Amino acid sequence: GVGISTGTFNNQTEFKFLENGWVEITANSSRLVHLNMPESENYRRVVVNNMDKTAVRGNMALDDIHAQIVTPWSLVDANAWGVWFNPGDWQLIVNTMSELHLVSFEQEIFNVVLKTVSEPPTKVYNNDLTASLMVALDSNNTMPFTPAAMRSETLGFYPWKPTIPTPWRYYFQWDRTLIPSHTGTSGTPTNIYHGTDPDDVQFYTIENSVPVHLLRTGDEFATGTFFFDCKPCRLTHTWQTNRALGLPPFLNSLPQSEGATNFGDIGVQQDKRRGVTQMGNTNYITEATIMRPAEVGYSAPYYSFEASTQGPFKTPIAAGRGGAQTDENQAADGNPRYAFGRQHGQKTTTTGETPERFTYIAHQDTGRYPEGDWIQNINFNLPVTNDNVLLPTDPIGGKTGINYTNIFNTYGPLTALNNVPPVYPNGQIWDKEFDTDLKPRLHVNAPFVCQNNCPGQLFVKVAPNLTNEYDPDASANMSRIVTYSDFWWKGKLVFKAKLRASHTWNPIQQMSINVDNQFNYVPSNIGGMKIVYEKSQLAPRKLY
């Protein structure tokens, strides 16, 4: 009906506790979405070329050359923690849960409204009861997957603030070459956009692949419930590194008086100790020598850019680093860095077009400190001679700033690592898996990776509101009545988690409000707000 409401606005998060410490977390979210008619009603294949920037020989990393199909459709993406949980709820989950399971997700569009503008510069807004809001749900997942969280373009993080969907667009194949160089490179290094391989051309259109529903004012649209199928995510971090795996050496001499300099001593000549090592050469059995079952973490090339058919790209790392050689200042390769606007956590009363940022440094110790790496000749005659060792200080290729660890890789059959932790609230929640024959062991952008089909994407678009003069036979762009729509969106994301118990004698890490952060969880006198990032795997767990 025209003058009837088709739904409920619910942003309540329910915690249903079940037998055996299981909890069914039901996150409800609703937002008022604002949508304008498309720039143009057509699909465009556009190429982006920032040649003048990558032509500065030393600037390869700043390459932006790519091709894309620009569609007249908008994308309603809610894949981001900030859309479902507020700080308070997040605290509860993170402090008391041990593991989190992604169960299901359903969403609907209701209370649709379409208005038109008519214009001394004074506008007037009216309701066009007959105008339609086009909704398309790509359930089959034909359209290429384009998670908005990667560009901080999801829905708003505050329930009492209207939001908007993002103009949908996807990558169109293109070949491109760009040879790396440095400040002093002589000549002009090849840097060109080759074009398109017809054999890889894929031009998709919502119209030809998805049934489109036309919603008028009294219409609503709901997707069914979609059940995820993916590994659980842990809310505990490991701390043990190869150096803390197994039975420690027996201390034959213990300290007899308190102090920070009163150590205990093993008490056996390093070369007369009993035990096992993988060094068939020496009889030295030290903590750095003793054999460990496998290897926690791995070393990978840092700030390595590889290039294939379409240009260079950063080689991704699984884990960050951090610790007492750390702490958002040294924050090197591996630690994700989120940049975002006012809709997703930046002080809303802040002016200027500079985003808010943060580098997420996980509590899990599975990274590497290259400065501490080194390689020595197999003969293992120590103290090691300069010619018999390769340090992170010895230059590679005559370059003063590149050492071996920079191109080093220790991934292998003995590598053990953990999946990335949830980044509240700017992080992505679930992600689609690659359609390659051999798949990656994890993704660095989300903890949940649908093994099957991921929920299909939801597209919206304001139907063309034609005037009385329309001539399709003409070359000029069609003139439409300025129309826009505002509709309500409601989602329900359901997780299942397990409550934790206390196994150590000591208490553990817990997120808490205090005198220093207190003002990050309350509005200002102007009504300003912000959502500060929070770590997720606070409690520790044994790794072995």
CB-side neighbour CA atoms (13 Å) of 430: 31
- Shortest approach of a second copy to residue 225 CB, angstroms? 19
Element containing residue 322 per DSSP (H, E): none
Asked if 337 and 533 touch (Cβ cutoff 8 Å), the reply is no
Is the CB of 272 or the CB of 542 nearer to DNA?
542
Is the CB of 105 or the CB of 363 nearer to a second copy?
363
3-state secondary structure of 402: strand
| 140 annotated as a binding-site residue | yes
Does position 365 interact with Mg ion (CB under 5 A)? The reply is: yes
Find the residue with minimal CB distance to Mg ion. Answer: 197
Token look-up 């209370």 returns 111
- Shortest approach of a second copy to residue 502 CB, angstroms? 4
Identify which range of 78-86, 200-208, 218-226, 472-480 contacts Mg ion by CB under 5 A. Answer: 200-208
Count CB neighbours of 166 within 10 A.
16
Does position 197 interact with Mg ion (CB under 5 A)? The reply is: yes
Is the CB of 321 or the CB of 530 nearer to Mg ion?
321
207 binds, among a second copy, DNA, Mg ion, none (CB under 5 to 8 A by kind): a second copy
Residues that bind DNA (CB under 7 A): 12, 14-17, 20-21, 98, 105-107, 137-142, 202, 223-229, 236, 435, 452-453, 455-456, 458, 499-501, 503-504, 539-542
Is the CB of 5 or the CB of 477 nearer to DNA?
5
Binder of a second copy out of 103, 310, 492, 497 (CB under 8 A): 310
Is the CB of 197 or the CB of 287 nearer to Mg ion?
197
Q: Long-range contacts: 14-20, Cβ < 8 Å, 24+?
A: 15/92, 17/499
Does position 357 interact with a second copy (CB under 8 A)? The reply is: yes
How far out from the chain centre does Cα 233 lie? 14
How far out from the chain centre does Cα 170 lie? 18
Is the CB of 196 or the CB of 277 nearer to DNA?
196
Binder of a second copy out of 26, 139, 226, 323 (CB under 8 A): 323
What are the distances in angstroms from CA 329 to CA 50, 321, 355? 30, 12, 19
Which pair of structure tokens corresponds to residue 40?
A: 């143009």
Distance (Å, whole) CA 63 – CA 52: 10
Name residues contacting a second copy, limited to 455-494 (CB under 8 A).
463-464, 466-468, 470-475, 478, 481-482, 484, 486, 488
- Shortest approach of DNA to residue 306 CB, angstroms? 25
Is the CB of 193 or the CB of 488 nearer to DNA?
488
Is the CB of 155 or the CB of 331 nearer to DNA?
155
Map residues 311-330 to x or -, x wherever contact with Mg ion holds by CB under 5 A: ------------x-------
Instruction: Give me the amino acid identity at 224.
Output: G
Asked if 171 and 68 touch (Cβ cutoff 8 Å), the reply is yes
Q: What are phi and psi of 127, to 5 degrees?
A: -95, 130
Does position 222 interact with a second copy (CB under 8 A)? The reply is: no
Give me the count of residues in the chain: 544
| DSSP summary character for residue 96 | H
Please return the burial class of 116, using the count of CB atoms within 10 Å of its CB with bins 0-12, 13-18 and 19+.
middle
Does position 199 interact with Mg ion (CB under 5 A)? The reply is: yes
Question: CA angle at residue 33 from 31 to 39, to 5 degrees?
Answer: 160
Does position 186 interact with a second copy (CB under 8 A)? The reply is: no
439's CB contacts (< 8 A; 6+ apart) are: 433
Does position 209 interact with Mg ion (CB under 5 A)? The reply is: no
DSSP collapsed to 3 states, 203-251? CCCHHHHCCEEEECCCCCEECCCEECCCCCEECEEECCCHHHCCCCCCC
Map residues 93-132 to x or -, x wherever contact with Mg ion holds by CB under 5 A: ----------------------------------------
Question: CA angle at residue 294 from 436 to 537, to 5 degrees?
Answer: 70
Closest to 499 in 3D by CA, of 22, 91, 94: 22
- Shortest approach of Mg ion to residue 246 CB, angstroms? 19
Name residues contacting a second copy, limited to 2-31 (CB under 8 A).
2-5, 7-13, 15, 17-21
Does position 224 interact with a second copy (CB under 8 A)? The reply is: no
Map residues 62-101 to x or -, x wherever contact with a second copy holds by CB under 8 A: xxxxx-xxx-x-------------xxxxxxx--xx-----
Asked if 338 and 345 touch (Cβ cutoff 8 Å), the reply is no
Name residues contacting a second copy, limited to 238-297 (CB under 8 A).
238-251, 254-259, 262-266, 268, 270, 272-281, 283-297
Please report, in range form, the residues annotated as the binding site.
Answer: 140
Please report, in range form, the residues annotated as the binding site for Mg(2+).
Answer: 140
